[PDB]
Design a protein around this ligand. Structure first.
Ligand SMILES: Nc1nc2c(ncn2[C@@H]2O[C@H](COP(=O)(O)OP(=O)(O)OP(=O)(O)O)[C@@H](O)[C@H]2O)c(=O)[nH]1
Ligand SMILES: CN[C@@H]1CCc2c(ccc(O)c2O)[C@H]1O
Lengths: 237, 51, 337, 287
């Protein structure tokens, strides 16, 4: 009868644990997980704290419209073999310093472009969308205006620049700086679109350190990602 | 530098055996422990706790 | 300097004249008249569910009754194989984990991941929720595997090309092993707990001595990363699996590989390698959503172990050789006999 | 005219084998494989169940009756047959409405889809909906609240060899409104909103990356709405009009349109099970 009694104990303990997992599954399904990745001196440090402290390894919590998000940094690895553990995230945030093209001596942008190309074509990340951030706006503008350094010498394809049609410059901006920015934007979007396959996309944005609207930008982009995934699920897009 | 050379010298001077003896030993062990393995040799349903 | 380099070349030159002469006749010729084991069929016996996400590792207990597994939701669950009833659910401070281990005494369980900390839990605590006892730190890279050498000391291999032998009572590195160039991924202990091997990421395997602190030999048969390693029950062999879908069996005494397993119909990777009690059967996982069973002496498939919808990343064979368990990214654990 | 009567038996008999085969294949595929166990796939399982009964219970008896032209069972049995037929017909449309509403919530509410729909709520919805189908179907038809008043109707109820559909205006109007007219506006509104969202997303992507780079959505929505509307629209207006005014639509036209309506059960697996997962599931078993 002791044997019967022990079987009774196991059933009651499975009974609590089974109940506990069910409560846990709902929370894990509620939240969305993001990965923060960028090159050195890009400004990831500025983005993780300057944006979240007012809005309210390194795991960061922030709340937008009562929707849970969870952001993982990457601590402070020329090879990358731990990236296979991040194939189930909602989106991958890429932060690259726009102002550092002349600074070096492979142009640092070129290294960032190579990293983005390698990440895009990874076998395990075939269906992960990338949100791209361009920091150092004011430094780039100051370098372009009355700047001894020339884009053409470092990047020889700039000789043909035509601001892309549907150009939407902000108010009171010189044409030269916009023609410079859209060149880099198109350079990244070329790599994005070469092998898009319609499963994942890249969203170009322009930003600086001061602005705090980026937290809403991430929310809107995540909403768009889920909407597009659902639309492709039912053979409508 | 020199420590690497010393370590390489230590690893180089190691006794070896003919591969035939090692193959024979492995085959002898495999033949000796053939009966015990249930995966290799089927076992009765009574003796299987997974049925 | 350069003269020292010439001195190293002098030393390197002797080994080839030795390994070439030692190779009399390969095992393939020697093992030719032994009859094949024939077709072996295996069917699922139990199915375990309850994990909310993919599974990375598992380790059978010493009684062939209990096992422990870890997922990416931050939860270790200890099961009961016969009754298929869970026993414990251990929350984790973090979420991403890459390894797990079970004590020979069955009262400690270890688990570490991307963070540079290896933790130890106390299962046999009276009237208490199982709780963290020690937190081992000192590594600069992500951990990959860890095994209990004893009840008081653990050996761990990290991603910064280093290995260490810890002490639970104090929490400091007693001996540190260096010499690898790529990240060390997996290791296995000898039955007598006298030596342990490790296959790194630079297509190289090494044999270490626990007591002395230095590497006795080194094998470089493979060409790509090594993702798993096992160790022969006799203690004079070990097999490694590499990304190029090739399994190789080496030898400690002969100091070179004896037989390689490959097929032209597979181009996927490998994630786990395990032997059997008799050593006759070699079980290897794949990325082709299934498992395989090889022959140690014939290099011929003897069956197919399929049924998983996602990739296989774990494997284990019981001490008594009663059953084999496979884990997959499909959040399902399966026990086959 | 032996050839014509014989040929009709060939056509009715084939129409039932296909209906049985498709639904049993879909049900087995859903039940056997655990990767297809999804919140949305429960509704497809229910929809399939209703069709199987129509294929196995209603269609062969109707074919036998229209061939022999003389009903050879009891009056209670033909009343039960009518109840089964109306139950299946009114339960085969609410499932489509529920699927459309679920798609609306899944597309237009992306951040609250997981919370709104759970494995527990789907069972509640399924049980609630099948119940309404019975209440119109059996309570009025079993109790004789639905009998007609004219002489021919009563003569047919009294006779134990004829059993035809004769009803008053109230029951016909209520049944038609509950079964077809209500679940049409909801589906139209849902699919219009979904199409608007798809067009908005396409415009956004074209604006964002048109330089380097609505047909699929139009085709899919057109198929899914047009097949249902074409199959089930004429019957649910003929049903009203022959009761509004008599001596307008003869019996053969009514039966022909009703049998056109029954064909709809043979196409739902062809439309709602075209995903690659269903394809590989079908290839896995019996292939
Ligand atoms: N003027 C200006 N400076 C900026 C802006 N954004 C970032 N910076 C500067 O760029 C620096 C980048 O360093 P951090 O972001 O602190 O961190 P980090 O060294 O890049 O971090 P790691 O890449 O992880 O090494 C910041 O410390 C700022 O001083 C910006 O919009 N304007
Ligand atoms: C004999 N078949 C019946 C006839 C009339 C009818 C059906 C279904 C739903 C209705 O609202 C009806 O009025 C059919 O199933």
């Amino acid at each position: 009868e002791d044997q019967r009694n022990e079987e009774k104990a196991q059933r009651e303990a499975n009974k609590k644990i089974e109940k506990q997992l069910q409560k846990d599954k709902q929370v894990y399904r509620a939240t969305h997980r993001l990965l923060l990745l960028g090159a050195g001196e890009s400004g990831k440090s500025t983005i993780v704290k300057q944006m979240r402290i007012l809005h309210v390894i390194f795991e960061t919590k922030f709340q937008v419209d009562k929707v849970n998000f969870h952001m993982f940094d990457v601590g402070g690895d020329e090879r990358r073999k731990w990236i296979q553990c991040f194939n189930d995230v909602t989106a991958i945030i890429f932060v690259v310093a726009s102002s550092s093209y002349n600074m070096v001596q492979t142009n640092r942008l070129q290294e960032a472009l190579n990293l983005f190309k390698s990440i895009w074509n990874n076998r395990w990340l075939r269906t992960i969308s990338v949100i791209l951030f361009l920091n150092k706006q004011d430094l780039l503008a100051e370098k372009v205006l009355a700047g001894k350094s020339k884009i053409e010498d470092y990047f020889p394809e700039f000789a043909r620049y035509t601001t892309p049609e549907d150009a939407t410059p902000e108010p009171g901006e010189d044409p030269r700086v916009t023609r410079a920015k859209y060149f880099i934007r198109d350079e990244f979007l070329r790599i994005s679109t070469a092998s898009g396959d319609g499963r994942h996309y890249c969203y170009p944005h322009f930003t600086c350190a001061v602005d705090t609207e980026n937290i809403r930008r991430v929310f809107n982009d995540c909403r768009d990602i889920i909407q597009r995934m659902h639309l492709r699920q039912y053979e409508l897009l | 530098a020199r420590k690497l050379v010393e370590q390489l010298k230590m690893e180089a001077n190691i006794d070896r055996i003919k591969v035939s003896k090692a193959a024979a030993d492995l085959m002898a062990y495999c033949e000796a422990h053939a009966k015990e393995d249930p995966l290799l040799t089927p076992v009765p349903a009574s003796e299987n706790p997974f049925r | 300097l350069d003269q020292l380099r010439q001195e190293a070349e002098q030393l390197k030159n002797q080994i080839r004249d030795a390994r070439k002469a030692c190779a009399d006749a390969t095992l393939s010729q020697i093992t030719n008249n032994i009859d094949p084991v024939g077709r072996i069929q295996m069917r699922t016996r139990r199915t375990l569910r309850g994990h909310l996400a993919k599974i990375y590792a598992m380790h059978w207990g010493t009684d062939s009754r209990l096992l422990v597994s870890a997922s990416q939701d931050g939860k270790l669950i200890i099961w009961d194989s016969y009754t298929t009833n869970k026993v414990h659910a251990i929350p984790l401070r973090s979420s991403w984990v890459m390894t797990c281990a079970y004590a020979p005494s069955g009262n400690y369980v270890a688990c570490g991941g991307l963070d540079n900390i290896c933790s130890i839990y106390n299962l046999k605590t009276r009237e208490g929720n199982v709780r963290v006892s020690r937190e081992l730190a000192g590594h600069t890279g992500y951990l990959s595997c860890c095994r209990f050498l004893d009840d008081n000391q653990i050996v761990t291999s990290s991603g910064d090309t280093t290995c260490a032998l810890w002490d639970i009572e104090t929490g400091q590195q007693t001996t540190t092993f260096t010499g690898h160039t790529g990240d060390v991924m997996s290791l296995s202990l000898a039955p007598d707990t006298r030596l342990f091997v490790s296959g790194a990421c630079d297509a190289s395997a090494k044999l270490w001595d626990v007591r002395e602190g230095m590497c006795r030999q080194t094998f470089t048969g493979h060409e790509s990363d090594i993702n798993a390693i096992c160790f022969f029950p006799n203690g004079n062999a070990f097999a490694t699996g590499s990304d190029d879908a090739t399994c190789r069996l080496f030898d400690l005494r002969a100091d070179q590989e004896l037989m390689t397993y490959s097929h032209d119909n597979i181009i996927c990777g490998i994630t786990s390698v395990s032997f059997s009690k008799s050593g006759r059967l070699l079980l290897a996982g794949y990325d082709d959503f299934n498992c395989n069973v090889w022959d140690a002496l014939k290099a011929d498939r003897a069956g197919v172990l399929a049924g998983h919808d996602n990739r296989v990343s774990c494997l284990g064979v019981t001490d008594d050789g009663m059953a084999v368990a496979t884990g997959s990214w499909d959040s399902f654990l399966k026990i086959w006999n | 005219d032996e050839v014509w009567v014989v040929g009709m038996g060939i056509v009715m008999s084939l129409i039932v084998l296909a209906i049985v085969f498709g639904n049993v294949l879909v049900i087995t595929a859903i039940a056997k494989f655990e990767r297809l166990q999804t919140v949305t796939n429960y509704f497809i399982t229910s929809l399939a169940c209703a069709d199987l009964v129509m294929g196995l219970a209603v269609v062969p008896f109707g074919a036998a009756h229209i061939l022999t032209k003389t009903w050879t069972f009891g009056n209670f049995w033909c009343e039960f047959w009518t109840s089964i037929d109306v139950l299946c017909v009114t339960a085969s449309i609410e499932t489509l409405c529920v699927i459309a509403v679920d798609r609306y919530f899944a597309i237009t509410s992306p951040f609250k889809y997981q919370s709104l729909l759970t494995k527990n709520k789907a069972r509640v919805i399924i049980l609630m909906v099948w119940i309404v189908s019975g209440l119109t179907s059996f309570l009025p038809i079993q109790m004789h609240w639905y009998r007609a008043t004219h002489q021919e109707a009563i003569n047919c109820y009294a006779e134990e060899t004829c059993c035809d559909f004769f009803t008053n205006q109230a029951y016909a109007i209520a049944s038609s409104i509950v079964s077809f007219y209500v679940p049409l506006v909801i589906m139209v509104f849902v699919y219009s909103r979904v199409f608007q969202e798809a067009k908005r997303q396409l415009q956004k992507i074209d604006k964002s990356e048109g330089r380097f780079h609505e047909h699929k959505a139009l085709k899919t929505l057109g198929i899914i709405m047009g097949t249902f509307t074409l199959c089930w629209l004429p019957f649910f207006i003929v049903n009203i009009v022959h009761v509004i005014q008599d001596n307008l639509i003869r019996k053969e036209v009514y039966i022909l349109l009703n049998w056109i309506g029954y064909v709809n059960s043979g196409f739902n697996p062809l439309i709602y099970c075209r995903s690659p997962d269903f394809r590989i599931a079908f290839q896995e078993l019996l292939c």
